[PDB]
Design a protein around this ligand. Structure first.
Ligand SMILES: *[C@@H]1O[C@H](CO)[C@@H](O[C@@H]2O[C@H](CO)[C@@H](O)[C@H](O)[C@H]2NC(C)=O)[C@H](O)[C@H]1NC(C)=O
Ligand SMILES: *[C@@H]1O[C@H](CO)[C@@H](O[C@@H]2O[C@H](CO)[C@@H](O)[C@H](O)[C@H]2NC(C)=O)[C@H](O)[C@H]1NC(C)=O
Ligand SMILES: *[C@@H]1O[C@H](CO)[C@@H](O[C@@H]2O[C@H](CO)[C@@H](O)[C@H](O)[C@H]2NC(C)=O)[C@H](O)[C@H]1NC(C)=O
Ligand SMILES: *[C@@H]1O[C@H](CO)[C@@H](O[C@@H]2O[C@H](CO)[C@@H](O)[C@H](O)[C@H]2NC(C)=O)[C@H](O)[C@H]1NC(C)=O
Ligand SMILES: *[C@@H]1O[C@H](CO)[C@@H](O[C@@H]2O[C@H](CO)[C@@H](O)[C@H](O)[C@H]2NC(C)=O)[C@H](O)[C@H]1NC(C)=O
Ligand SMILES: *[C@@H]1O[C@H](CO)[C@@H](O)[C@H](O)[C@H]1NC(C)=O
Ligand SMILES: *[C@@H]1O[C@H](CO)[C@@H](O)[C@H](O)[C@H]1NC(C)=O
Ligand SMILES: *[C@@H]1O[C@H](CO)[C@@H](O)[C@H](O)[C@H]1NC(C)=O
Ligand SMILES: *[C@@H]1O[C@H](CO)[C@@H](O)[C@H](O)[C@H]1NC(C)=O
Ligand SMILES: *[C@@H]1O[C@H](CO)[C@@H](O)[C@H](O)[C@H]1NC(C)=O
Ligand SMILES: *[C@@H]1O[C@H](CO)[C@@H](O)[C@H](O)[C@H]1NC(C)=O
Lengths: 46, 115, 216, 323
C-alpha cells in the first residue's frame, strides 16, 4: 500500500503528509439465489 | 453493500523514513498493529495518549507524527497550548517592552497567461 | 536578516505561488495527455482514422475524438475561469494590502499580519507578490493593581488617554500599550461626575501643575 | 467520489472503457480533493487564529455582565455555550445510499468539540484580556475597564461607562436574553447555514438520481445491459451510460468548485470579521452591524460561525441650537 501512492505522485520523493491511494472494496463471498402454487399431480396421478 | 473507502497512506517524508501507516477510511476494523479511530481503520501506527500539536492531519482531530527506535504514532490532535489568564477585577497587565517582527506574507497576483 | 534564511533555508514558504504555477502546468499536461486518449475512437492519431477507414465511417469516429477533445477543452477552460476567479480574489486582497498596508498604515487588526502594524514593504515574486510587514509586538508584562478612576476631592478623575495603575504604592497614569509611568496631574485626567457612582474608584491625590507655581 | 465505482458499478466491462477517457476519472478526485483539502483551511484560519487555548477564571465578576449563556457549558459532555446548542438543534439514510455508490463524506478535521474550544478561547480571551491577545501575549485587564476603551473606539468618552455601568449591564444582559428567545422559535435566521447544507445534499441527491437515468441507453442498470446483449453491443451502449454519468459528474463537480469558492469568499469574510471585529474593535462602519461596534462574541454552528455583535446605538435626541 505504500508503493501504490508513489505511483500517484509519480515521484520517488514523497513529501511529509497524507496521500490518497486507490480505493479498496470488500468482495463477495458467495451468491445467494432465493425463490419463494402446486401442480395437481397428486390429483392426476393418484 | 459491503463497506469501502479511500486508502490513505500516512507517511513522514520519504526523506526521514520508508515506514508508512495506512489509514483505511470509514471501515470498522475487520475487513483488513491495528488502531480503530473515528475516521477509519488505521494500521501501522501505535496509539498515543499525550496529545501534541497537530502534524499530519487525518480526520476527527487525529494527527500523526513520526517521532517516538522511532515509529509513526497517532493521537488526538491537541489544540494549541493551554493557558488560563490570571484574572481579577483590579488586575491589569501592561507590557513594559516590545519587539519588532518582520513577517513575510505571500500572495498570488497573476497566473500564467495562456491562449 | 532572518527573513533571508526563512526563505533561504525552507522551500515551502512559497507554496502558495508554487501551487499556482504547478496547477497551471498541471492542467496543461492533463490537457495535452487528453490528445492521446481514444475517447472510444479507433485511435488517438487524427490521421490514422483517416488513413485506415474510408471517410463516410471515419466521420463518426472523428466525432468521438472531437466530442471528447472539444469537451476536454471546456473542462480545461472552465477550470481556468474558476481558478482565475480565485486569483482575481487574491489579487484584490493584494491590491487592498498594497493600498492600505504599504501605502498607508492599517488599523485593521491582523489584516497586515499578527501584531500592531507599522509599515509594509512589497517585494515581487514570480506571478505573485510578497509583503514584509514590520509589526509591533509587545513583550514583557508586569502585573499592576489598577483602578478605573481616582477620587480626589470627591470629584472623579479619569485618565485622558491610557489608564491608571499602581505597582502597589503610587498611582500612575500611563499609556496602554507600553509602560511609561507618569505622576498623575490634572493635565493627565479630566473630571467627571463624582465619586459615589463609579465602581472601584480609589483614593489618591492628583497633583496640580499649577498649585506649586503659585506660592511665589 | 470514486469515479471508477460511481460510473461503472463494480464491473470491469465498464471499467475498461473508462480507461479510454483518461484523466477524467482521476482529475475529478484531484478537483474534489482540491476542495476538501482547503475546506479545512477555511476552518483553520477562521477559528484558529489563537496561539493558546485560554479559559476563563473559575469566578466571574465582570461588573454585572452575565456571560453564562455564551461561555462553555461545564455540564454538557461537549462543552458548548447554552446558545450554541440552540443552533445545533435548528440546523440538521441519505448518507447510506451515497455511501453506497462511491460517495463518501470525509470527517471535518476539527470535531465540534474542538471548534468549541477555539470559540471558547477567543471568547475567553476577549473577555479577560481585552483585544491584546491578537497582537501578542494576552493581558489580563478588568473587563469593566476594557469597555472604557471600546467606547473611546466609538468616540464616547469613558466617563459615560463608569457612571452608566449598571444601566449598560442590564441593557447588555437583557439583549442577550432576546437572542435566545429569537433562536428558540426562529428557523430562518440560520437560513444562510441551512441553505448551504441543503444545496449540497440537493446536488448530492441529483447526482445520485442520475444513476437511474437511461441517458439514451437501453437501461440505467449497468449489468442488465450486459446480460441482455452480447458485449460488442454493450461497448456501444455503456458509452451512453458513461458519457451520461461522466458528464453528470463534471456537472456536479464544476458546481462544487463554484460553490466552494462561494463559501471560500464567505470564509475569508469570517476570518476578516473574526480578526477585526472580535480580536479588535472595527472602525469600519456597519461591517460588524448597525451602530458603533463594541465587541463581538463568536459562536460555533454546524459548518459555520455565528457572531454576536455588541453595538452601541444612540437613542433619545434633543433639538439643539448650535454654532
Ligand atoms: C527591551 O527588550 C530588549 C530586547 O527584547 C532589550 O534589549 C537588550 O538589552 C540588553 C540590556 O540589558 C542588551 O544587553 C541587549 O543587547 C539588548 N538586546 C538587543 C537585541 O539589542 C532592552 O534592554 C529592553 N528594555 C528594557 C528597558 O528592559
Ligand atoms: C512603585 O514605583 C514608585 C515609582 O518609582 C516607587 O516610588 C519610589 O520608589 C523608590 C524605590 O527606590 C524610592 O527611592 C522613591 O523615593 C519612591 N518615590 C517616592 C515619591 O516616594 C515605589 O517605591 C514603587 N513601589 C513598588 C512596590 O515597587
Ligand atoms: C476614600 O477615602 C474616603 C475618605 O477621604 C473614604 O470615605 C469614607 O468612607 C467611610 C465608609 O463609609 C465613611 O465611614 C467615612 O465617613 C468616609 N470619610 C469621610 C471623610 O466622610 C472612602 O471610603 C475611601 N474609599 C475607599 C474605596 O476606601
Ligand atoms: C446569569 O444568568 C443565569 C441564567 O441566565 C443565572 O442562573 C440562574 O440563576 C437563578 C438564581 O437567580 C436560578 O434560579 C436559575 O435556575 C439559574 N438558571 C440557570 C439556567 O442556571 C445566573 O444566576 C446569572 N448570574 C449572573 C452573575 O448574572
Ligand atoms: C436612558 O434610558 C434607559 C432606558 O433604556 C433609562 O433607564 C430606565 O430608567 C427608568 C426610570 O425612568 C427605570 O424605570 C428603568 O428600569 C430603566 N431601565 C433600565 C434598563 O435600567 C435611563 O434612565 C435613561 N437615562 C437617561 C439619562 O435618559
Ligand atoms: C531531509 O534530508 C536531508 C539530507 O538528505 C536533510 O538535510 C534534511 O534535514 C532532511 N529533512 C528533514 C525534515 O528531516
Ligand atoms: C465494529 O464492530 C464491533 C463488533 O464486531 C463493534 O463492537 C464496534 O462498535 C463496531 N464499530 C464500528 C465503528 O462499526
Ligand atoms: C492511555 O491511558 C490509559 C489509562 O489511563 C491506558 O489504558 C491506555 O492504554 C493509554 N493509551 C495510550 C495510547 O497511551
Ligand atoms: C501575574 O500573576 C499571575 C498569577 O497567576 C501570574 O501567572 C503571572 O505570571 C504574573 N505576571 C508576571 C509578570 O509575573
Ligand atoms: C473585586 O472582586 C473582589 C472579589 O474577589 C471583591 O472583593 C472586590 O470588592 C472587587 N473590587 C472591585 C473594585 O471590583
Ligand atoms: C425637533 O424638531 C422637529 C421639527 O419638526 C420635531 O419633529 C422633533 O420632534 C424635534 N425633536 C424632538 C426630540 O422632539
Amino acid at each position: 500500500p505504500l508503493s501504490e501512492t508513489k505511483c500517484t505522485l509519480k515521484s520517488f520523493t514523497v513529501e511529509k503528509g497524507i496521500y490518497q491511494t486507490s480505493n479498496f472494496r470488500v468482495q463477495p463471498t458467495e451468491s445467494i439465489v432465493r425463490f419463494p402454487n402446486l401442480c395437481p399431480f397428486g390429483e392426476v396421478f393418484n | 453493500p459491503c463497506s469501502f473507502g479511500g486508502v490513505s497512506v500516512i507517511t513522514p517524508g520519504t526523506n526521514t523514513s520508508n515506514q508508512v501507516a495506512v489509514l483505511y477510511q470509514d471501515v470498522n476494523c475487520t475487513e483488513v498493529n491495528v488502531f480503530q479511530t473515528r475516521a477509519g481503520c488505521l494500521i501501522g501506527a501505535e496509539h498515543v495518549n499525550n496529545s501534541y500539536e497537530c502534524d499530519i492531519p487525518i480526520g476527527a482531530g487525529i494527527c500523526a507524527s513520526y517521532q517516538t527506535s522511532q515509529s509513526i504514532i497517532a493521537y488526538t490532535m491537541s489544540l494549541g497550548a493551554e493557558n488560563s489568564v490570571a484574572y481579577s477585577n483590579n488586575s491589569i497587565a501592561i507590557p513594559t517592552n516590545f519587539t519588532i517582527s518582520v513577517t513575510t506574507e505571500i500572495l498570488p497576483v497573476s497566473m500564467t497567461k495562456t491562449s | 536578516g532572518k527573513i533571508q534564511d526563512s526563505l533561504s533555508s525552507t522551500a515551502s514558504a512559497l507554496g502558495k505561488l508554487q501551487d499556482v504555477v504547478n496547477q497551471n502546468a498541471q492542467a496543461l499536461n492533463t490537457l495535452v495527455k487528453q490528445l492521446s486518449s481514444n475517447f472510444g475512437a479507433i485511435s488517438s492519431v487524427l490521421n490514422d482514422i483517416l488513413s485506415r477507414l474510408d471517410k463516410v465511417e471515419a466521420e463518426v469516429q472523428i466525432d468521438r475524438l472531437i466530442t471528447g477533445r472539444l469537451q476536454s477543452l471546456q473542462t480545461y477552460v472552465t477550470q481556468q475561469l474558476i481558478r482565475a476567479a480565485e486569483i482575481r480574489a487574491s489579487a484584490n486582497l493584494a491590491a487592498t494590502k498594497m493600498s492600505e498596508c504599504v501605502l498607508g498604515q492599517s488599523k485593521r487588526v491582523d489584516f497586515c499580519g499578527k501584531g500592531y502594524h507599522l509599515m509594509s514593504f512589497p517585494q515581487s515574486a514570480p506571478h505573485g507578490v510578497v509583503f514584509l510587514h514590520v509589526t509591533y509586538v509587545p513583550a514583557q508584562e508586569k502585573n499592576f493593581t489598577t483602578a478605573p478612576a481616582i477620587c480626589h476631592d470627591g470629584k472623579a478623575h479619569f485618565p485622558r488617554e491610557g489608564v491608571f495603575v499602581s505597582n502597589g504604592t503610587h498611582w500612575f497614569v500611563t499609556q496602554r500599550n507600553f509602560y511609561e509611568p507618569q505622576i498623575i496631574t490634572t493635565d493627565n485626567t479630566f473630571v467627571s461626575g463624582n465619586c459615589d457612582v463609579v465602581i472601584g474608584i480609589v483614593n489618591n491625590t492628583v497633583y496640580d501643575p499649577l498649585q506649586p507655581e503659585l506660592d511665589s | 467520489v470514486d469515479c471508477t465505482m460511481y460510473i461503472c458499478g463494480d464491473s470491469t466491462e465498464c471499467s475498461n472503457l473508462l480507461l479510454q477517457y483518461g484523466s477524467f476519472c482521476t482529475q475529478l478526485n484531484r478537483a474534489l480533493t482540491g476542495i476538501a483539502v482547503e475546506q479545512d483551511k477555511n476552518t483553520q484560519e477562521v477559528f484558529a487564529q489563537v496561539k493558546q487555548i485560554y479559559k476563563t477564571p473559575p469566578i466571574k465578576d465582570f461588573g454585572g455582565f452575565n456571560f453564562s449563556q455564551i461561555l462553555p457549558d461545564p455540564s454538557k459532555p461537549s462543552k458548548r455555550s447554552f446558545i450554541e446548542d440552540l443552533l445545533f438543534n435548528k440546523v440538521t439514510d441519505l448518507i447510506c445510499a451515497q455511501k453506497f455508490n462511491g460517495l463518501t463524506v470525509l470527517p471535518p478535521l476539527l470535531t465540534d468539540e474542538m471548534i468549541a474550544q477555539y470559540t471558547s478561547a477567543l471568547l475567553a480571551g476577549t473577555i479577560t484580556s481585552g483585544w491584546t491577545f491578537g497582537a501578542g501575549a494576552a493581558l489580563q485587564i478588568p473587563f469593566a475597564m476594557q469597555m472604557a476603551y471600546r467606547f473611546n473606539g466609538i468616540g464616547v468618552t469613558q466617563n459615560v461607562l463608569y457612571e452608566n455601568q449598571k444601566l449598560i449591564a442590564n441593557q447588555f444582559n437583557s439583549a442577550i436574553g432576546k437572542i435566545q428567545d429569537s433562536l428558540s422559535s426562529t428557523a430562518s435566521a440560520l437560513g444562510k447555514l441551512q441553505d448551504v447544507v441543503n444545496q449540497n445534499a440537493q446536488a448530492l441527491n441529483t447526482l445520485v438520481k442520475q444513476l437511474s437515468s437511461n441517458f439514451g441507453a437501453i437501461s440505467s442498470v449497468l449489468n442488465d445491459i450486459l446480460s441482455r446483449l452480447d458485449k460488442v453491443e454493450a461497448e456501444v451502449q455503456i458509452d451512453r451510460l458513461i458519457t451520461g454519468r461522466l458528464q453528470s459528474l463534471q456537472t456536479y463537480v464544476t458546481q462544487q468548485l463554484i460553490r466552494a469558492a462561494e463559501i471560500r469568499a464567505s470564509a475569508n469574510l469570517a476570518a476578516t470579521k473574526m480578526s477585526e471585529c472580535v480580536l479588535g474593535q472595527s472602525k469600519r462602519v456597519d461591517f460588524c452591524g448597525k451602530g458603533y461596534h463594541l465587541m463581538s462574541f463568536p459562536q460555533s454552528a454546524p459548518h459555520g460561525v455565528v457572531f454576536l455583535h455588541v453595538t452601541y446605538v444612540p437613542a433619545q435626541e434633543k433639538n439643539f441650537t448650535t454654532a
